[PDB]
Design a protein around this nucleic acid. Structure first.
Length: 1126
DNA sequence: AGCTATGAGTGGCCCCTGTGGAGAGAAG
DNA sequence: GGGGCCACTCATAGCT
RNA sequence: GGCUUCUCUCCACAGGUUUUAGAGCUAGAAAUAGCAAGUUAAAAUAAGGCUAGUCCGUUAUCAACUUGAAAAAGUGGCACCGAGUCGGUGCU
């Protein structure tokens, strides 16, 4: 008798519930066979559980790390390129300089040259640090010096710039000279009054420098500056000029009465040619106005960055840092003098004690600038003559470091100007600098375009670059070796979605002329007209459709019903009155691309030729693909014989956006076998049928449906793994779905492989995507008519229904007590699913037998924590390299153990070197997983183990479960620590009262229900003691933490006077002590309770090891006590 | 008987961070 | 959030 | 309509840490006290891998046993009864 059942699921991001229910809704339990060498042969477990696992990580952290690694590699490579450039001349002056630079990190013992990395003699180091206190002094010296400079210093400056070349958010040359806001603003006002003497404006008394450089948003600054300008509006010509000076994107259409939009932005890569467009429309007289606007914008943005405008130099960043250092020196001297004279007691704390947030901690220690200002402010308040120091502290300019987080805003054009100045002033005395100047400027400025990507020879799963030749790519031949046009096309296309109806085909651009014709004809297909003398509405003929398109759609950008009635039905067909159905007011489709090309090419015969359709489609694709206009220009040059120079320049500056939904093959690529017409052909003319796109693809009399079905991949089960990961959503939900499918498969196996009658599923707040993956596998049988025989029904539900069903019949839930809530949610989901198609539910809730399974995952990821700890005399520090002994060089710490292996061998113990039989868990860190799996015996012997019994080696990943006396379980967190493995269970009687009491004021309900809650909570003061009694008993039984439990009991007795609700929130805080997983610190009322930690793994070395399947229904108990016996 | 080495428990502290530009998608 | 590490004390095995 | 959620991929940037370099002085045998100084740089930023790429290394996948290089396939009885992390009656 094959028993009927169904499968319910509770899918989350951290957990995947599961359940099996029958006709009477009871969850059965089956006697599962227990494999292994223990005395236990079978365990009867309930068909319910809750898989738990670490939350799936989005690749965001991994992607950031990968992009960082590529930046590091390419920056090291820039260093290598500069060292190759310097290499030949370096050997003539100092051959080992580059070697010393690499050996700087090592101690004096490991260095192969003299310990001074720059000069190798201490006299020259003294001279260097006396002459150049920092690097910015050296940069200024090199930028200003005319004398022959030392090559090592030049390399240091150039490498400092190349390694820290600043941001690329501004393209086009930027003048560092213009940095004064107010003077240039008045200059712009004077220029505007010169070009417009008839209507000049006055800006006297307006503090433009303060307002425009204020720390406010661009719109606020624009409003504030205009508010000081009489007669001016923020939307006016001058207001738009100011907005342009602020880096916004003003629209000049209304300012010059232009027909088309005129939007300009200096920060865009295309300001110059768009400005030329505007000048060609309004005249060349306005060129100086926009030039002054650009200069003022440069001045404003620079003043937002640097502060030294008084000093005259062409290195506007070295001077700023030197000035900061001088201010720091002078202010420190003054502060030390004042503290010496007035408050001698705290001199030591401020200037010596590296453990405080004083100047010692700020400079010689680890304290940041904010904390240093916090600590130094009250001391300044308590002393006289500190007005200047208080002012500088208000400006965040007191005692400020050169290398702070404010250097980010520096444009890379400043660094490029400094680089050019250096390479110009040093080229005379060093020929190779002059010869390779362009190469170095390239290396600083060369940036692998965001559309090219990783430069891989196919060996990468992230690479899409297409190559012309096989030369090694260097910045100087990046253009020559790689076709940037093809690279950009691949970059765009690989991301663009493939057609749904045609999976192998590509989607068309939105502004495709063929797509526009398709849409126009498809919309015109269902248009019906009613004229006098006609009994029924009739579809428009193909001739009528073509005439309408030619008369209106090619002549008007937007066509309305009234315009159609007036222009075609009355003028052409001589129908005075016509009724149109299917279109309400106007036609949605528009030949905007066709009208634009009519404006540009101005040859309507060329556009109307179907022979030119391929050329026009290629033009649309070229305009849609490429943002950099050079790519479009080079591609469209294949058509330079078809258009004049002006038309070609017009095509260059036009751009299109968006990608459509359908492919060219689907519309005008495939043809009917019987007729030879495409879908576009049928839409243009279909006779009486007048079938639209949907009708054409769903007509069985046409071969189009057959072509689509054949094109549809009728593939076998192709990579069930990586199939689910193809969905749209976070990787967390993807992992949830995959684990859900695996759990469903294992449940199918457990239930005798008889497929379920129904499947009830919910999803964490996408459900359809989950349902398809399951109903594809569940239903695979076809009847005599090729129809699917649905032996499995897939129903998906909503959390509101389940929550209401729970609260109506009091199947309440608490999310803080224990982890049985996932399984309970799964069971209630199954019950509600059958409801769409009472004691049992309470029994299922009250079962402690639940199979909570922590997914034993071999941890991957960071080998150890990223914070490098100081050098110490300890053995637990991890080397960061092969030659970096952790004692001598510090290094990483806190390894993440991949898994641990039970090693039974003999180890020499004591100074006597006597071999002693041992049995202990050795944790294999992730850094050594490959070495261990390569040859376990050599790895184990390397750690001091001898006569290793390879037969007894067991692989124990993180969260491997052990069973001890009284059923005490400890999950293997790592080699030297455990976790609580037992799931504390409270009966429902405590479960209801806890959430009723803690969420007391927060709940809102009817007055009688609130009174019932009052009575229910007030009576259970006796439960408030039973809860801590159960906690204490479970603690003694498994937690075994008497000190923390005693502190809890004392605190609970101490705070018993406070009201029941206030007690309740703290009582639920207790369960952080008992809940499965790692212990976490919790506080009871005012009292803070330390966390109990299990740093002892000895007790499990004699325990019954348990392996559990993904559901845990199949297990293999191993008794380790029988292993290792002598 | 006394000195040193060494394993278990407990209390405390630590852990990389911030930003910009471009493209393409699901769903609201 | 949680595993790792250290400073500290105490019981116990070992040793003579 | 836009700009939102959320994901991927790419391009860059400013820091942070470690270790070393930036000669600490005086009195005192030393412990130690007084004084002076604190702003920068190099290297590394997951060990490393072979396909030697200006590529790849934290995403995702992974109970145990048998076969298989691997993908992959197979491996374990059910019912009644009562059912705290489980046991009995028939029966396989």
């Amino acid at each position: 008798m094959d028993k009927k059942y169904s499968i319910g699921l509770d899918i989350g991001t951290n957990s995947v519930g599961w359940a099996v229910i029958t006709d009477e809704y009871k969850v059965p339990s089956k006697k599962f066979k227990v494999l292994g060498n223990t005395d236990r042969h079978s365990i009867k477990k309930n068909l319910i559980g809750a898989l738990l696992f670490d939350s799936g990580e989005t690749a965001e952290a991994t992607r950031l790390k990968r992009t960082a690694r590529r930046r590091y590699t390419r920056r090291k490579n820039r260093i290598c390129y500069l060292q190759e450039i310097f290499s030949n001349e370096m050997a003539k002056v100092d051959d080992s300089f580059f070697h010393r630079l690499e050996e700087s990190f090592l101690v004096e013992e490991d260095k192969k040259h003299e310990r001074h990395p720059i000069f190798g003699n201490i006299v020259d180091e003294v001279a260097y640090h006396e002459k150049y206190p920092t690097i910015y002094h050296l940069r200024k010296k090199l930028v200003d010096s005319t004398d022959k400079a030392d090559l090592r210093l030049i390399y240091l400056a150039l490498a400092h710039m190349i390694k820290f070349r600043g941001h690329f958010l501004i393209e086009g040359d930027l003048n560092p000279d213009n940095s004064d806001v107010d003077k240039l603003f008045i200059q712009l006002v004077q220029t505007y009054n010169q070009l417009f003497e008839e209507n000049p404006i006055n800006a006297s008394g307006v503090d433009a420098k303060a307002i425009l450089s204020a720390r406010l948003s661009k719109s606020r600054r624009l409003e504030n500056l205009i508010a000081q300008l009489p007669g001016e509006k923020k939307n006016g010509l001058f207001g738009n000029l100011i907005a342009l000076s602020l880096g916004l994107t003003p629209n000049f259409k209304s300012n010059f009465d232009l027909a088309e939009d005129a939007k300009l932005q200096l920060s865009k890569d295309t300001y110059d040619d768009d400005l030329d467009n505007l000048l060609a429309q309004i005249g060349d007289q306005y060129a100086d106005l926009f030039l002054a606007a650009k200069n003022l914008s440069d001045a404003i943005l620079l003043s937002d960055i640097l502060r030294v405008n008084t000093e005259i130099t062409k290195a506007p960043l070295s001077a700023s840092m030197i000035k900061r250092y001088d201010e720091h020196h002078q202010d420190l001297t003054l502060l030390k003098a004042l503290v010496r004279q007035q408050l001698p007691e705290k001199y030591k704390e401020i200037f010596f004690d590296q453990s405080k947030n004083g100047y010692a901690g700020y400079i010689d220690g680890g304290a940041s600038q904010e904390e240093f200002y916090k600590f130094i402010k009250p001391i300044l308040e308590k002393m006289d003559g500190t007005e200047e120091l208080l002012v500088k502290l208000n400006r965040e300019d007191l005692l400020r470091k050169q290398r702070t987080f404010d250097n980010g805003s520096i444009p890379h054009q400043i660094h490029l100007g400094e680089l050019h100045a250096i390479l110009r002033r040093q080229e005379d005395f060093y020929p190779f600098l002059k010869d390779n100047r362009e190469k170095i400027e390239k290396i600083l400025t060369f940036r692998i375009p965001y559309y090219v990507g990783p430069l891989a020879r196919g060996n990468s799963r992230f690479a899409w670059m297409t190559r012309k030749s096989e030369e090694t790519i260097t910045p100087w031949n990046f253009e020559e070796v790689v076709d940037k046009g093809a690279s950009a096309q691949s970059f765009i296309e690989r991301m663009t979605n493939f057609d749904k109806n045609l999976p192998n085909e590509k989607v068309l651009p939105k502004h495709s002329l063929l797509y526009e014709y398709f849409t126009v004809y498809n919309e015109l297909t269902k248009v019906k007209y009613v004229t006098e003398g006609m009994r029924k509405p009739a579809f428009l003929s193909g001739e009528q459709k073509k005439a309408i398109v030619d008369l209106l759609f090619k002549t008007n950008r937007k066509v309305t019903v009234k315009q159609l009635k007036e222009d075609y039905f009355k003028k052409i067909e001589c129908f005075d009155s016509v009724e149109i159905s299917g279109v309400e007011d106007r036609f949605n489709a528009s030949l905007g691309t066709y009208h634009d090309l009519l404006k540009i090419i101005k040859d309507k015969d060329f556009l109307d030729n179907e022979e030119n359709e391929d050329i026009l489609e290629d033009i649309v694709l070229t305009l849609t693909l490429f943002e950099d206009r050079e790519m479009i220009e080079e591609r469209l040059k294949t058509y330079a014989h078809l258009f004049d120079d002006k038309v070609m320049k017009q095509l260059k500056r036009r751009r299109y956006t968006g990608w459509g939904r359908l492919s060219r093959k689907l519309i005008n690529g495939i043809r009917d076998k019987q007729s030879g017409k495409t879908i576009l052909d049928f839409l243009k003319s279909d006779g009486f049928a007048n079938r639209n796109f949907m009708q054409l693809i769903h007509d069985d009399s046409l071969t189009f449906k057959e072509d689509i079905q054949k094109a549809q991949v009728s593939g076998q089960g192709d990579s069930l793994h990586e199939h689910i990961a193809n969905l749209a959503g976070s990787p967390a939900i993807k992992k949830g779905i995959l684990q859900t499918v695996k759990v469903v498969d294992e449940l199918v196996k457990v239930m005798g492989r008889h497929k379920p009658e129904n499947i009830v599923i919910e999803m964490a707040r996408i459900t359809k995507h989950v349902a398809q993956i399951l109903d594809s596998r569940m239903n695979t049988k076809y009847d005599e008519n090729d129809k699917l025989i649905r032996e499995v029904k897939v129903i998906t539900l909503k959390s509101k229904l389940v929550s209401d069903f729970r609260k109506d019949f009091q199947f309440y839930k608490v999310r803080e007590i224990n982890n049985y809530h996932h399984a309970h949610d799964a069971y209630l989901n199954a019950v509600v699913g059958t409801a769409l198609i009472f004691a049992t539910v309470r029994k299922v809730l009250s079962m402690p037998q639940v199979n909570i399974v922590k997914k034993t995952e071999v941890q991957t990821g960071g080998f150890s924590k990223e914070s490098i700890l100081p050098k110490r005399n300890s053995d637990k520090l991890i080397a960061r390299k092969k030659d970096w002994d952790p004692k001598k060089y510090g290094g990483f710490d806190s390894p993440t153990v991949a898994y641990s292996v039970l090693v039974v061998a003999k180890v020499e113990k004591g100074k006597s070197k006597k071999l002693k039989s041992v049995k202990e868990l050795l944790g294999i860190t992730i850094m050594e997983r490959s070495s261990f799996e390569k040859n376990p015996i050599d790895f184990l012997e390397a750690k001091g183990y001898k006569e290793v019994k390879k037969d007894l080696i067991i692989k124990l990943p993180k969260y491997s479960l052990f069973e001890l006396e009284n059923g005490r379980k400890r999950m293997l967190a790592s080699a030297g620590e455990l976790q609580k493995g037992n799931e504390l269970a409270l009966p429902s009687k405590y479960v209801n009262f806890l959430y009723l009491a803690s969420h007391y004021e927060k709940l809102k309900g009817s007055p009688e229900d609130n009174e019932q809650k009052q009575l229910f909570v007030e009576q259970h003061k006796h439960y408030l003691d039973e809860i801590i009694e159960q906690i204490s008993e479970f603690s003694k039984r498994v937690i075994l933490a008497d000190a923390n439990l005693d502190k809890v009991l004392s605190a609970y007795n101490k705070h018993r006077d406070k009201p029941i609700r206030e007690q309740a929130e703290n009582i639920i805080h207790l369960f952080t002590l008992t809940n499965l997983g790692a212990p976490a610190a919790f506080k009871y009322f005012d009292t803070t309770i330390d966390r109990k930690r299990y740093t002892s793994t000895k007790e499990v070395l004699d325990a019954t090891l348990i392996h559990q399947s993904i559901t845990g229904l199949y297990e293999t108990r191993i008794d380790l006590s029988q292993l290792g016996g002598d």
